[PDB]
Each structure stands twice: as structure tokens, then as C-alpha cells.
Amino acid sequence: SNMVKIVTVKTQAYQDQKPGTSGLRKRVKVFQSSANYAENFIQSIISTVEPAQRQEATLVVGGDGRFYMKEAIQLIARIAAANGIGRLVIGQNGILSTPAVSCIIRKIKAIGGIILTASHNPGGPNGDFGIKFNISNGGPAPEAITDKIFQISKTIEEYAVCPDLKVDLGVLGKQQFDLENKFKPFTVEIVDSVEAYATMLRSIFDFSALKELLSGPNRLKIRIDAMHGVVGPYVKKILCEELGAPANSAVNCVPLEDFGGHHPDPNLTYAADLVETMKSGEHDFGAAFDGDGDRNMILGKHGFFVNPSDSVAVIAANIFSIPYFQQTGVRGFARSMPTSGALDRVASATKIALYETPTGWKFFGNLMDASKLSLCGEESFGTGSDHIREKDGLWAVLAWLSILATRKQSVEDILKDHWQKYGRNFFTRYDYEEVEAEGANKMMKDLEALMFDRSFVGKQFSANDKVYTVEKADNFEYSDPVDGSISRNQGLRLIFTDGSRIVFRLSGAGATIRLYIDSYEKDVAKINQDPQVMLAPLISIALKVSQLQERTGRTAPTVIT
Ligand SMILES: [Mg+2]
Secondary structure, three states: OOEOOOOOEEEEOOOOOOOOOOOOEEEHHHHOOOOHHHHHHHHHHHOOOOOOOOOOOOOEEEOOOOOOOOHHHHHHHHHHHHOOOEEEEEEEEEEOHHHHHHEEEEEEEEOEEEOOOOOOOOOOOOOEEEEEEOOOOOOEEOOOHHHHHHHHHHHEEEEEEEEOOOHHHHOOOEEEEEEEEEEEEEEEEOOOOOOOHHHHHHHHOHHHHHHHHHOOOOOEEEEEEOOOOOOOHHHHHHHHHOOOOOOEEOOOOOOOOOOHHHHOOOOOOHHHHHHHHHOOOOEEEEEOOOOOEEEEEEEHHOOOEHHHHHHHHHHHHOOHHHHHHHHHOOOOOOEOOOOOOOHHHHHHHHOOEEEOOOHHHHHHHHHHHHHOOEEEEEEEEEEOOOOOOOOOOHHOOOOOHHHHHHHOHHHHHHHHHHHHHHHEEEEEEEEEEEHHHHHHHHHHHHHHHHHHHOOOOOOOOOOOOOOEEEEEEEOOOOOOOOOOOEEOOOOOEEOOOOEEEEEEEEEOOOOEEEEEEEEEOOOOHOOOOHHHHHHHHHHHHHHHOHHHHHHHOOHHHOOOO
């Protein structure tokens, strides 16, 4: 049973297996009840690897612990073996965070990896499942490759598999499989889920300083909520065991196949338990992660919310608290276009390039590969650096802890100081979910026509007393300086002379309108007011100029962040 046979299985192609930018995601039920659905897709991935290069290739494999993960990993082993892939490196119990996969790929020079995650989407018998493909730079497979995978998947007629091959995912070390009538063996290395990632962080951060910060009587008190997802053992082994945080610091840090029956998506309501804990006033710092660990929410004492747009700005403004950046220097900053302009204030002051990209990883990855990007952020709870090629939630937490250690102030005092220094970008995102597509499309088309008129620049909007003047209005376009691609229709931007912006996007069962409001204030009498009060005038202007209520019938957003 260490010696196994290779067989060819006739199959019937499916027509909807698009790998997308974040992976193929379907209901678990779909993978289970659709004959050869997973097999087809995994074969299609492996078929993108040239036969001549398969024996010397390694794929990194692991996922976020959700229901069906281990069955999918076994299936990946069976098919990779049969196809002549020489080696898989698999996290113990199948567990690898998305940042750990990126880490390991780059460390061992793997050709890529397959990540079993659907990120922040629910899991369990009635939940979702996802299959994500990363390539040799440790980042998401780009469109040319996902296109090829899709094309193969649509006409596949057979796949190769070792049906009797079974991996013990629970035990560390090398397992070898001899394939019938194949000269070279198939090798699986089970590795500790945390070690490589922790060794990376140990080099990036000053663990001595952090241990001192987190240990003993005068310690910074923290609560870190992995939301029953993949980052749990990382918190326990790094923050608690290595850096000495009391075990109670690790909240929901046992991976559960259904993430405890909840969505592992960090925000004020999905992580309401963490927020309520922080409200007691006993802890200095709180954070929550999404299911696969590339998203993070940051909280201060009393449940003070650091919005993600501000978070990346504060990290930029204190970036040399982190040993990694002392060594590399700061190669550049970037944020997605709908993210608030807080980062740009820091970049301008420190005279570092600011790249404003369309939504999507590929734009950050390109700039990092060009040695032009050290720190990036997205308003959707995303923060990262060029240490790897995925965003990294726990990395962002250790960045914050490093800054707290050097500043010796509370989270809230650091933000107040920041706002006083740079001005404040009040920020919110309104989501209108499942709106009728016809109305939403008409809303966008009509608004863009309005904005394109010659007289629209210079138009004034009263608040009142306060007057907003349109400086620039367009449909965002981006020419990538690395791959030369031009991305068009990336969002309607109303840019005002006082540094403020309104941005409209349609999401990529009914459309989702995303409305981003970025209101800049410099006045001391304004920067510490209530955010929804300070944002109300631009929100009003946004709804009036777009006629959103009139076009969609919505009097209120579905979600406010
Ligand atoms: Mg994620």
C-alpha cells in the first residue's frame, strides 16, 4: 500500500470551472454531488505544468480547515502523483494559512501551490468550498494561467489518478509512494503548519522586544480572535508560546470545520464577541482574522475601531519600528483606489511614492516584484508587505505590536496623534446588496455621463456653509507600469478640491453597489468628531448626484463599514 497503481478515468467536463482571482468557489454540496467536479479541476491545474518539468517540481498544498478540505487534499495527492509531479509539501492536518503557503512556496522555490480555502465565506456541510492556485512567486495565478485552466477544464475527457494512494496528513516527515511502472517515486513531505511562517516572522520582527511587551505584570494585554479559522495555531504558537502572551490571549484559536457556525470575516458585527470583550476596558489591543488569514481588523482599548484605511497609514508613519523595513528601506506605498487617502498623506510628507491601484492583488504583486512596493493596504481589512505575495493578517498584528512597543502609547492615542499630524480621512463604505442589475447599471451609466460633461469639473455642492468643489471626475483607469495592461472602468470617482472623494463601484444574484466616502478634515475642532456625523454631508451629496434612491428603490445601505 506504499506501492500504488496509476489509472486513467474517463470524465465529463463541466462548463463553469473558472479559477478567478481568488480561486474557484462553489457550494460544498456541488463538489460532493457533481461526479469528478474536483478531480476535473485539479487535473486542469496540473495540466498547465509542462510534463518535462513535473518530476523536479514541488507543489505546496494546504488550506483553512473547512469541511471537505482533507478529502480535497487526498484527491490532489492522488492526481499529482499520477501526473508525474515529484513532490507535495503539505501542512500538518492539511492546515496552512494563505500567507504560510506564499511563504513556503518562495522559501523552497516551489512551482506553486494549491490552497483549499474560500477565505471569509462560510464552511461546513452546507457551506462553501474553494480551490485557489498560486504560482512560483508565491502569489495568485494571473489571468493568462487561470484562463488556460478554465479552457482545459471545459473540454477535459479524462484524468490520471492513483486511486489507492492515501496520505497520512497527521504525522510529520517524508512519505514515499512507489508508482507501478514508474522509475521515480512520488514524495509527500508533511511539515508543521506554523514553523516556516514563524521563522519568517522571527526574522521580520524583533521577537525579543515583543516578548518583553507581552510578558509579565506590566504587559500589554491583548485579545486575538482567529474566528475558528486557520490562523488559530499560528496565534497560539507564536503569540502565546514563543512571545509569552497568556493563553487567554488566543481567542477562538482552534480551527473548526464550520468555523463555529459563523462567517470567519473580521468586522465589527461578524466579530461582535471580540468587540464586546474589548468594550470591558481590560485589554489594550484586539484583532480578528478571516478564515485563511490574509485579512485583519484592529481594535484598541474600549473597542476603539482602527479602520483599515487608517491602519495602513499608521503602519507607514511608524514603519521603521519594524526591523524588516530598517533593512530594506521603504521601496514604495500603495492602496487600492477606493481605500481612503490617509496613506497618501504619509507618503507625501515622507516623500515616498504612492501607487493607487485598481481593486485586485495583481497590481500590488507587480509593483513588489519591481522592487517598488514595501507596504500596501485595502479598505476591505487587507494589509501586506513584500515579505510574501499574499496579504497577511497576523503580520499586520505584529506590525501594530512593534509600533505599540516603540511608541509606548495606547492605540487610540496613536490615532489621535496621527490625525493631528496628517489631518483625518473620515471614511466609510456603504454596500447596497442584491440590487436589481438594470437599475444599478442605469445609475452608473447616468452618473458617468453627468461627470463627463465639460461643466462638471468646478461644480459646487453646498453642505451648507461648507462648499465642496469638484476638482476631477472620471471612470478610473490604470496603466500597469510592469505588465503594460490597461484596466478600465474601475470605478466612478468624484474628487474634491479639499482632499475629499466619493467613489462608486459595481461589484464583480443581483448587483452590489459599493459607495466609498472619504472626507478629509484638518481642523482640530473636527478631527475628533463622530465619523458618521462628519461624513453625512458627502453622503448626502453622493446620494443626490447619483440618484441612487430613485434608481434602486433603496433608502439605506445593506451594510455600513
Ligand atoms: Mg482571506
